[PDB]
């Protein structure tokens, strides 16, 4: 009965569509972007990547058992970190740049101290307590991290003590992705049950649940302002969710594409939504009109990860063919 | 125009790339196998002569080849997410319990699920039908009937070409090749030539399954080579 009342409020809320509100705006038209660089030296599939805050540096993880940080401008490998386990579904760079984190099927998040005396990378803190594989790790601050897991629970940790300060438990399936808000006070999770939840880190309870997806939502990202997020699914449709309105405004779908979205990312302005597909091509969507503007196809294998640089300069996409390529 | 510090950084990067290439050549030598079996199938006891909550790993080498065996013991019933990672494996060792007739249909459906998976399409399956001794004991007791679980066994005749082992009853042979025929009948229509199945009858107390895995791995690599050299 409560669910019916909740659905009734959403229906009355929507007076107009984002398409019709948007329709009196100039199209972006056609945008073309060419691969400025390609980063060799990965011997196996690239599962995930994350840009640094400075945006010169990025970290990428692979099945080969190596977590290697790059200098993007010069294409030079800054560090090379032997990984104890070849299974790694995620990597994360701290906002300050001192730490880089790694998570995988071994049920542990490993925190690596990049900057230290003796000039080698060592494991500052190994985090344990999750029953399922860690799908995504993201740093709130240097001292605290949040990890999304396949056991249907997201957790917030503190790195010094190594114990879960809070646990987030409202999902019914594996949590595939986690995306932190710009203000850090709240985050949004995407999970295989096809519902996206808005969590609050301080209170440890779900504020909102959005369910406009038929299939699992693989990847999820915040709009830059922080009042909206976008999801990516095996449905081959990307859906733009709004927090304050509490309903989905827009859906991005085309009849040609039928493959799942591996990764979603937003431009700094928020006009362009970049989506990475299993069909070996990343499609640039005008987020406000749901009209395709271009394709970024230079990968033989699937594009596992996509990331937009903090200064907005670049887009770096890692793919299963082990080559990672900036697209300025 | 590169600074002295930038030249030193490039030298560091080249040394790192050299060490990475050395580790990659070390990694290419070993062969990798994914083990996927239900409980009671004795999946842990497939290999015993020679031998981390998410993955339990056992490494065995026979005749100058290194085999890397991966078993996932820290996941729920549904396996579709972590199965995507194991797409580069040389072969899959699928274990099914022949003795437990109630769970055999579940094993058959699991075989359909693994065989028809999109990521595990090109990979071949080395099938091990375990506990043949227990199957023989059950049919010797005779209370259990395979016909009641599957109607087709009630009218079945053993193939003439198949050679029985010494001391093997014809109805024991009938049941064994019946279960094998069901699994291989799933295998046949789905493959299309990209991969194939290697049905093997394995007692619980069997001295060598490493020799069987090695021979089927050689066959997989040989067929990959025959496909790569444009012979087929």
């Amino acid at each position: 009965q409560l669910k019916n009342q909740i659905r009734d409020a959403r229906k009355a809320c929507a007076d107009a569509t984002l398409s019709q509100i948007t329709n009196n705006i100039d199209p972006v038209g056609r945008i073309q972007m060419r691969t400025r660089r390609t980063l060799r030296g990965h011997l196996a599939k690239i599962y995930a990547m994350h840009w640094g805050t400075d945006s010169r540096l990025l970290v990428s993880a692979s099945q080969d058992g190596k977590l290697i940080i790059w200098d993007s401008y010069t294409t030079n490998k800054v560090h090379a970190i032997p990984l104890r386990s070849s299974w790694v579904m995620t990597c994360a760079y701290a906002p300050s740049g001192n730490y880089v984190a790694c998570g995988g099927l071994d049920n542990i998040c490993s925190i690596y101290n990049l900057k230290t005396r003796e000039g080698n990378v060592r494991v500052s803190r190994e985090l344990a307590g999750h029953t399922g594989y860690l799908s995504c790790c993201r740093f709130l601050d240097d001292n605290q991290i949040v990890t999304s897991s396949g056991d249907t629970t997201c957790a917030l940790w503190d790195i010094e003590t190594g114990q879960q300060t809070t646990t987030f438990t409202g999902h019914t399936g594996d949590v595939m992705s986690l995306s932190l808000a710009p203000d850090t006070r709240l985050f949004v999770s995407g999970a295989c049950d096809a519902s996206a939840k808005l969590w609050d880190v301080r209170e440890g309870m779900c504020r909102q649940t959005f369910t406009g997806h038929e299939s699992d939502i693989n990847a999820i990202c915040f709009f830059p302002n922080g009042n909206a997020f976008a999801t990516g699914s095996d449905d081959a449709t990307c859906r733009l969710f709004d927090l304050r309105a509490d309903q989905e405004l827009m859906t991005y779908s085309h009849d040609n594409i039928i493959c799942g979205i591996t990764s979603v990312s937003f431009s700094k302005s928020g006009r362009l939504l970049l989506a990475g597909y299993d069909d070996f091509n990343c499609n640039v969507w005008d987020a406000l009109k749901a009209d395709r503007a271009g394709v970024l196809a230079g990968h033989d294998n699937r594009v596992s990860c996509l990331g937009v640089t903090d200064d907005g300069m670049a887009v770096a996409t890692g793919s299963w063919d082990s080559f990672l390529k900036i697209w300025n | 125009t590169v600074s002295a510090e930038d030249k030193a950084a490039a030298e560091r990067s080249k040394m790192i790339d050299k060490n990475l290439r050395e580790d990659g050549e070390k990694a290419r030598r070993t062969l990798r196998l994914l083990l996927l079996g239900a409980d009671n199938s004795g999946k842990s006891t497939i290999v015993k002569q020679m031998r981390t909550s998410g993955i339990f790993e056992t490494k065995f080498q026979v005749d100058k080849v290194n085999f890397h065996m991966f078993d996932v013991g820290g996941q729920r019933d549904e396996r579709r997410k972590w199965i995507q990672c194991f797409n580069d494996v040389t072969a899959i060792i699928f274990v099914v319990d022949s003795s437990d007739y109630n769970r055999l249909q579940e094993a058959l459906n699991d075989f359909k699920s693994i065989w028809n998976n999109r990521w595990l399409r090109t990979i071949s399956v080395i099938l091990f039908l375990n506990k043949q001794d227990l199957l023989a004991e059950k049919v010797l007791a005779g209370k259990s009937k395979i016909e009641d679980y599957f109607p087709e066994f009630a009218r079945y005749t053993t193939p003439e070409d198949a050679t029985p082992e010494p001391g093997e009853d014809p109805r024991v042979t009938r049941a064994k090749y019946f279960i094998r025929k069901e699994f291989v009948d799933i295998s046949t229509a789905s493959g299309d030539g990209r991969h194939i199945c290697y049905p093997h009858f394995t007692c619980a107390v069997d001295t060598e399954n490493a020799r069987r895995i090695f021979n089927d791995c050689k066959d997989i690599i040989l067929q990959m080579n025959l496909r790569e050299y444009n012979l087929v």
Partner: single-chain antibody
Amino acid sequence: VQLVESGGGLVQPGGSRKLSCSASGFAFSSFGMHVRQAPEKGLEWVAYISSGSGTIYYADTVKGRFTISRDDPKNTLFLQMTSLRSEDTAMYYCVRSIYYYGSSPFDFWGQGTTLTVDIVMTQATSSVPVTPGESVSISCRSSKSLLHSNGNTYLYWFLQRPGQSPQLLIYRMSNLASGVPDRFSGSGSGTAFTLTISRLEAEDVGVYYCMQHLEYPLTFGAGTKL
């Protein structure tokens, strides 16, 4: 993290002497190693050996008769000198350096051993007497611009307390060295480089050396004693 050294003593001219630097406490293979000091003069660069010994440079005044080799399993590097002369008396410092994006080379220096027998970097070499609590500014000029096209400016400031090997204060004129108090601050435009200190206090009186790193050979400053 230590860098002990051995060898020295009286040596007749034209002889030979092997100086060894045994590192113990860090990953010796990842650090490119390098410096001497006359009895009454500033620091003078000598040589350099890269990671894996893939690159070597020498000062022109010691070219053709100085050799360096590093025993990575032993965690030690040596300096083989032949045809010594009266002007080679100095105290040799074993200095580490690691080169990547955001690194801090010359961070740690050796103890030093007494042995007895281009970009021109200018320092005023005159420093007002030390006054606690009063700001002090030390300026070092350069012959050519040290700001490379990539945007990094290659200046390093080193402080030598009396009776202690010099310590890195600032790397690239704007980035503070690790473990040093925040009061030190460096700034300046091209060819006009300054080091500013606020809230001066004890345990800071020493000689301030300005070093360049745009290209070899590395030329130090004359030094400004407080």
